[PDB]
Structures are given as C-alpha cells and as structure tokens.
C-alpha cells in the first residue's frame, strides 16, 4: 500500500527522484519554463549535472516526508503551507502539481511493480487541495 510504496521509493530515493523528475518534464515539456537550467539536454546529460541530482533528491526526500506525515493520503496543512510558502514556489500554481502527479501516477502503473498507484492519485488530488486551502492559485 501507500506506506510500503514510500519505503520502497526511499530504497532507491536518488533512482525514483530522477526518473519521475523525467517523466514530468518529458509528458509536460512546457514545464521546463520553470527550469530553464535543464532545456537542450537529452535525460543522460541532465543525470550528470550537479543540480538536477541534488536538488531532484531533496525536492523527492521532503515528499516522502509528506507523503509519511498524511492520514488517508491527506498531507497536513502545515506541509501544505510550506510548500505554498517556499520562496522557490513563488512561481508556481497548483496546475504544476497536478501534473507532476499524474506523470507519478502513470509512471507507477509502467514500472514493473505493486505500487498502490490509487494511493498516489488520490495523494496528489489532496496535495492539490490542501495547496489551494494554504493560498496557492
Ligand atoms: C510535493 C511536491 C514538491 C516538493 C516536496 C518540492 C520541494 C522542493 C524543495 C525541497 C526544493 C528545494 C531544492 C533545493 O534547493 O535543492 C524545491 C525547489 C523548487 N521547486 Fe519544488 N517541490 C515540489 C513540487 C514542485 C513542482 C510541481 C514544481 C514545478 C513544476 C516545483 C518547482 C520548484 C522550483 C522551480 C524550485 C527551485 C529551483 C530548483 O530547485 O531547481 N516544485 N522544491
Ligand atoms: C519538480 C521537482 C521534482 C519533481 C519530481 C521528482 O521526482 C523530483 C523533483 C524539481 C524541482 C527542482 C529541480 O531542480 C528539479 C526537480
């Protein structure tokens, strides 16, 4: 279910942050406006720049803490509020993580494996909610 899905996602924490990161960006180019560091690379180049490793890792290890601190794939209203409040998110609405979770979800259901990928969906219409609650538009 959801819980071992987080473990099983933190077991190869740098792998997952990656690859998902990649699907995003490659179901939803466009969103690259938001990251025009990473433009004109194939995903082997993005995977050998410095940043996009790093900050993939701590972008996915605070969402696990999330994801960890939800009852019922509902986050708290404090993780909400930070992730609204963030000066990094200044730019974003809650499109942006509609579509990171449903790149999340799909890439789930191809992966060989039981991920609950119900849990996941359900995760990200309530971080979209709790979001729009805690001031994103
Ligand atoms: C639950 C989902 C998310 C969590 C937990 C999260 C978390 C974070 C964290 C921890 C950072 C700081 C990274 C660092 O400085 O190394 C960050 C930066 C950033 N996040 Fe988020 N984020 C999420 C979703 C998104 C989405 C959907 C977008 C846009 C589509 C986004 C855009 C950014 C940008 C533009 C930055 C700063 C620039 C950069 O680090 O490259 N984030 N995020
Ligand atoms: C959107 C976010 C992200 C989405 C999915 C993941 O598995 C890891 C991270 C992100 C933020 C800042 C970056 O520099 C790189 C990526």
Redesign the pocket.
């Known amino acids: 279910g959801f819980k071992q899905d987080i473990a099983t996602l933190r077991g190869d924490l740098r792998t997952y942050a990656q690859d998902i990161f990649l699907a995003?960006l490659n179901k939803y180019p466009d969103?690259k406006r938001?990251?025009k560091?990473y433009v004109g690379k194939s995903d082997q180049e993005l995977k050998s720049m410095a940043?996009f490793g790093?900050?993939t890792?701590?972008?996915?290890?605070?969402?696990m803490?999330?994801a960890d601190r939800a009852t019922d794939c509902v986050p708290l209203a404090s993780d909400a509020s930070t992730?609204v409040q963030?000066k990094?998110?200044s730019?974003?609405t809650t499109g942006?993580?509609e579509?990171?979770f449903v790149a999340l979800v799909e890439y789930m259901r191809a992966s060989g494996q039981s991920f609950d990928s119900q849990s996941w969906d359900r995760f990200g219409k309530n971080?979209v909610s709790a979001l729009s609650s805690a001031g994103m538009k």
């Open positions: 995003f969103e938001n990251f560091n940043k790093d900050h890792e701590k972008v996915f290890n605070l969402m803490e999330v992730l963030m990094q998110h730019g974003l942006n993580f579509k990171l971080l």
